[PDB]
Design a protein around this ligand. Structure first.
Ligand SMILES: CC1=C(CCOP(=O)(O)OP(=O)(O)O)S/C(=C(/O)Cc2ccccc2)N1Cc1cnc(C)nc1N
Ligand SMILES: CC1=C(CCOP(=O)(O)OP(=O)(O)O)S/C(=C(/O)Cc2ccccc2)N1Cc1cnc(C)nc1N
Ligand SMILES: [Mg+2]
Ligand SMILES: [Mg+2]
Lengths: 539, 535
C-alpha cells in the first residue's frame, strides 16, 4: 500500500482539524474508503443518507472548525447539495469529496450508472459551483496542489469546498508532506489599516455611549475568545443576534439579552439601538435575525467589521482582515470606552411555550452543546440565558428543518464528552429521522427534546393555520429508538406537565444513555419572538 | 378569489395528466398551496421530506405519465435535486414548482431566509438547468406562455421541467383557457420518412430471423401497447432490458427472458444476439443493463429507434418521431412476416425469487431498488398488465420505497409490491409514515442481509463501511403511526414466506415482510455484473 493521492488528501484533512469523515459509500469511492478505514488519524462515520451526512458534517465543523463529507458520483453528491448550500450560506467549512468514475471511463463518455445517460461527467461539478468557494477536478497532473488550494481557500473564507476524486487518480503515487497545511495570516497594508484606525478613533472619541454587537462570523473565524476578552477588558453593553448566540457568557455584566430588532426585549433595544455608536462585528442583518428588518441602526451610528473589509459610517475600508480590524477596535475601545454598565435585571401545570423555556433555562450548564431547529424551537431558544462555554448551534439564515437532528449527530461525534441537547419540532425531526439510528449504533447519549404540537405551527402562525398542509403524519416518538435499533441504549419519556419535564431533565442530567423526551405542547402556542416575526411581513 | 396565475398553472398541470401534487410546504409557497387545496381537480400530497417527495412524484409519473413536485425556495428545491436528476436521467416528466420570495424582495437583494446571504435569487434556478429540459422564472409579463412552453417541452421530451413561482406572481390575474394544453404530434418530412422506410425495408427484407428488443423509452412515450400488438401481429423473439421490463407479457410465445448482455440466459442470448437483424426500440445500453458493456450487437445487425432519430446500420435518419419510426417498422415487419416463435428450508436468493414468482399476478405494480432486489427481480417472468419500476441508470438507493408511495397514490386499486434492501430503505424510511397516514396497503418486502451486500460483492466484503445500523424492521410502522393497522412478519424459511404471501395476497392492510437472507448471497446477474468489472 504505497502512499498515494488518497493518503495525501486524508493527511491534509487532519491538518485542517478534521478527525472524522462523514458520508455514504458507493462503488466509485470504495477504494478511497479503504484508505479512510486504514488511516490511524481519520475515522469513517457512515450515515443513513447523504443529506443527513452533510448536515452532520456541518454540525461537526461548528464544533471543530472544519469538516469533510464523502459521497459517490451523482446520486450521492446531489443528495447532499442542500447541506453544502446551508454550509455556504452560514459560512461553515465543510469539504465535499465526491468519488467519481475513473478518468478513462469519463473520457470515453460511457453510459455509466449515476449519470444522466449523456456521456457527460461534469454536470454535477458545475452545479456545485455557486455553493462552494473553491472546487477542483483532481487529475494525476494536479492532484496535490489542487487539494492544497481548495482547502486553503476554505480555511480563509470559512466556507465549503468541492473535490471530484476519480478512482484512478486516488491511487496515483504521492509524497507525504513534511509540514502541516496552515493558512498564513494575512496582513493589511499598514497605511490601509491606519486609515480605518483613524476613522474608527475619530468616531469613538466622540461617542458618549458605545455598544458591541457580535455575531456568527466571529464564531466561524475562530474569534470567540477575542470578543469575550474584549468585553471583559472593556466593560460595555454587548449582545449577539440569534446566529451568533453563544459568543458571550450571557450572565456577564453588560449583557441584557439577544438582539432581534423590534422583537428585542426593552433593555436590549436601549442597550444596542440606544447607543450613539454600535460596533457590528461579523454581523449579517437577516430577516429572521431582525424581526423582518425592523432593526433601528443607521450607517453613521455604526462601525462594522466583515472578513475582508470594515466600514466606519459611510466609508468602507477594503483589504483589512477581520482579525486586525478587531484588534484595532479593542485598543480604541480600551482608550475611549470607560463605562460601568448597569447590571442586568418551580414552574408547574400544563406545558406551555413559556414554562417550557423557563424549565430548560434552569437545566442548561456550561459545556452544553445546544442545537435548535427552525420553528418554535429556535425562536424560543433565543430567550435562553446561556452560561459560559456553550456551543449554541442554530441555522436561521439557510433555515432547513431537519438540519438540527442530523447536525446533533455530527456535533456529538466531534465532542463525545460534552452534553448535547437537541431542540427539534415534531415536523423537523421527520425529515432526518434515520440519523437517530446512527446515534444509537454509535452509542451516543444526546438529550433529544421533540416539541410535539402535532403539525407545522410556525407556518400556522404565518398562514393557513387550519389548512391541511400544515398537518403531518403523527408519529409514536417514544417508540422510534426501539425501531431503529435492535438494542438501543436509550430511555424515552412523554411529558405534558412542567414539573414532569423538570423531573425528567433532572434524571438525564448526566446523560448516561440517549434520552428522547416527547414534549406535549399546544397546537397554536408560539414563543414571543415568533409573534413579532409572524407579524413582520404582509404589507 | 379571482382566477390567477396559480390557478392557470394548476389547470395546465391537470391537462398534462397529474391529479396530485407532492411536496413540502414553506412560507414562500403557502399562498400557492391554498389554491392547490381549494382546487377540486388537484390533490395535495404532503411528504415527509423533499427528496422523498421528488422520488414519489417520479413513481407517480411512471404510472400516470406526468407528475408535479412543489418545494420552497432554496432549502426545499435543493433537497429534491437528486430526485429531479434521476427523473432527467431516466426520462420521467416531473414538474418542479418552486415557491419563491416576491419579485420586489428579490430585486432589492434582501437578506432573506433560504438564501446564501448574498442577495442573489437565481443561483438555484441555474443549478437546475442541467437536469431539466425546460425551465422558466415566472413573471407578471410572461407567466402563462412560459407555463405552456415548459409543460409542452416536458410532454415532448418526457423529462423534468422547472418553474420558479414568486409569491406575488402567483396572485396576478389570469384567464381560464377554453382549450386544454395539448402537444400536436410531430410528423417527419415525407422525404425524410421515405429514406428511413426504404433503408429499414431493404435491410429487413434480407433477414432470415429478426428479433425485437424494446426498453424504457417505449414506456415513457406511451408506446407499450404499440409494442405488444407488434409482437402479437408479427410473432418473433423479443425481450427488454432491465429498465424497460414490463413492456411485454413475458409468458407470451417468443419471450425467453430479460436481455442483459453476457449475463443473459443462454436462450435469451441466442434469441436476441443470434438473430441476423435486431430491432432496438428505445434502448440505452448502460453498464448495468449490459453486464459491463458485454452485449454483442453490431451496427450492421441492428435497426435502432430513438425519440427524434432512427438508425439503419451505419446511417442515421434524424427528425423522425419514434412513433412514426415504430409505425413504419410495424408495417414493414407485416410485409415480411415469416418465422413463428418456438418454445425447502432456509431462505436463499434463489428460493426467494422462485417463491415470489408464484405470487405475482396481472395488475401488480412492482418496484425494486438497486442491490440484490433489482438484480434478482430481473429474473421474474412478468404476466400481463404489470408496471415494473426500476431505476438502474440513475441508481439512487432509497428511490424505491418513496416511489412506491407515489405509485400507490397514482393507482389506489392496484397491488403494490416493494422490493427494497435493508440499506436502501434507511435513506427514505420516513415516507413509510406517509403510506400509513394515507391508509395505503402496499406489500413491502425488506431484504435484510444486514448491510450493503451488493457493495460487498464489488469491493471490501469485510470492510465496516459496508455495514449499517441494524434496525428492528417489524417495529417501524408502530413507531411512525399511532394506529398503523399494519401486518408485519419476519421470515427465514421459504415456506413461511410462501404462507405469508398467501395471507397478504389481497393487500387489505399495509404489510411489511422482513426477509432474512444470507449476507454473502448474490443473485445470478449481480455475480455477473461484478465479474466484468473486477478486471
Ligand atoms: C416546513 C417548515 C416548517 C415546519 C416546522 O414544523 P415543526 O418542526 O413541527 O416546528 P413547530 O411546529 O414547532 O413550529 S418551518 C419552515 C421554515 O422555513 C421556518 C421559517 C418560517 C418563517 C420564517 C423563517 C423561517 N418550514 C419550511 C421548510 C420546508 N422544508 C425545509 C427543508 N425547510 C424549511 N424551513
Ligand atoms: C450504497 C449503495 C448500495 C448498497 C445497497 O444496500 P442494500 O439496499 O441493503 O441492497 P443489497 O445489495 O444488500 O441487497 S448499492 C449502490 C449502488 O450505486 C448500486 C450499483 C452499483 C454498481 C452498479 C450498479 C448499481 N450504492 C451506492 C449508493 C449510495 N447512495 C445512493 C443515494 N445511491 C447509491 N446507489
Ligand atoms: Mg410542530
Ligand atoms: Mg442489504
Amino acid at each position: 500500500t504505497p502512499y498515494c493521492v488518497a493518503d495525501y488528501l486524508l493527511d491534509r484533512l487532519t491538518d485542517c482539524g478534521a478527525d472524522h469523515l462523514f458520508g455514504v459509500p458507493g462503488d466509485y469511492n470504495l477504494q478511497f474508503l479503504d484508505h479512510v478505514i486504514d488511516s490511524p488519524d481519520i475515522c469513517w462515520v457512515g450515515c443513513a443518507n447523504e443529506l443527513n451526512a452533510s448536515y452532520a458534517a456541518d454540525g461537526y465543523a461548528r464544533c471543530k472548525g472544519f469538516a469533510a463529507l464523502l459521497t459517490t458520483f451523482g446520486v450521492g453528491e446531489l443528495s447532499a447539495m442542500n447541506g453544502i448550500a446551508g454550509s455556504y450560506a452560514e459560512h461553515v467549512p465543510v469539504l465535499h469529496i465526491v468519488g467519481a468514475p475513473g478518468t478513462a471511463s469519463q473520457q470515453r463518455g460511457e453510459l455509466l450508472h449515476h449519470t444522466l445517460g449523456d456521456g457527460e461527467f461534469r454536470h454535477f461539478y458545475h452545479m456545485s459551483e455557486p455553493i462552494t468557494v473553491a472546487q477542483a477536478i483532481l487529475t494525476e497532473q494536479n492532484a496535490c496542489y489542487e487539494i492544497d488550494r481548495v482547502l486553503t481557500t476554505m480555511l480563509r473564507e470559512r466556507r465549503p469546498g468541492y473535490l471530484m476524486l476519480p478512482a484512478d487518480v486516488a491511487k496515483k503515487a504521492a509524497t507525504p508532506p513534511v509540514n502541516a497545511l496552515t493558512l498564513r495570516h494575512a496582513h493589511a497594508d499598514s497605511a490601509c489599516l491606519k486609515a480605518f484606525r483613524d476613522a474608527a478613533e475619530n468616531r469613538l472619541a466622540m461617542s458618549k455611549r458605545t455598544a458591541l454587537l457580535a455575531d456568527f462570523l466571529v464564531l466561524r473565524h475562530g474569534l470567540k475568545h477575542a470578543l469575550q476578552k474584549w468585553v471583559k477588558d472593556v466593560p460595555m453593553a454587548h449582545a449577539t443576534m440569534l446566529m451568533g448566540k453563544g459568543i458571550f457568557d450571557e450572565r456577564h455584566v453588560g449583557f441584557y439579552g439577544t438582539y432581534s430588532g423590534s422583537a428585542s426585549a426593552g433593555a436590549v433595544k436601549e442597550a444596542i439601538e440606544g447607543a450613539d455608536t454600535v460596533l457590528c462585528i461579523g454581523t449579517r442583518f437577516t430577516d429572521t435575525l431582525t424581526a423582518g428588518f425592523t432593526h433601528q441602526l443607521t450607517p453613521s451610528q455604526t462601525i462594522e467589521v466583515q472578513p475582508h473589509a470594515s466600514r466606519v459610517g459611510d466609508v468602507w475600508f477594503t483589504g483589512i482582515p477581520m482579525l486586525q480590524a478587531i484588534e484595532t477596535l479593542v485598543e480604541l475601545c480600551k482608550q475611549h470606552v470607560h463605562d460601568t454598565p448597569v447590571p442586568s435585571s418551580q414552574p408547574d401545570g400544563s406545558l406551555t411555550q413559556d414554562n417550557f423555556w423557563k424549565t430548560l433555562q434552569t437545566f442548561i450548564r456550561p459545556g452544553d452543546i445546544i442545537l435548535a431547529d427552525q420553528g418554535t424551537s429556535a425562536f424560543g431558544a433565543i430567550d435562553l440565558r446561556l452560561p459560559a462555554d456553550v456551543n449554541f448551534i442554530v441555522q436561521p439564515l439557510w433555515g432547513s428543518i431537519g438540519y438540527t437532528l442530523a447536525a446533533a449527530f455530527g456535533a456529538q461525534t466531534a465532542c463525545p464528552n460534552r452534553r448535547v441537547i437537541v431542540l427539534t419540532g415534531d415536523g423537523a425531526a421527520q425529515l432526518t429521522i434515520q440519523e437517530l439510528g446512527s446515534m444509537l449504533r454509535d452509542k451516543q447519549h444526546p438529550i433529544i427534546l421533540v416539541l410535539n404540537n402535532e403539525g407545522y405551527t410556525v407556518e400556522r402562525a404565518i398562514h393557513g393555520p387550519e389548512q391541511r398542509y400544515n398537518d403531518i403524519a403523527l408519529w409514536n416518538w417514544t417508540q422510534i429508538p426501539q425501531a431503529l435499533s435492535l438494542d438501543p441504549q436509550a430511555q424515552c419519556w412523554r411529558v405534558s406537565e412542567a414539573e414532569q419535564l423538570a423531573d425528567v431533565l433532572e434524571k438525564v442530567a448526566h446523560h448516561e444513555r440517549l434520552s428522547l423526551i416527547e414534549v406535549m405542547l399546544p397546537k397554536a402556542d408560539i414563543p414571543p419572538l415568533l409573534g413579532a416575526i409572524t407579524k413582520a411581513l404582509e404589507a
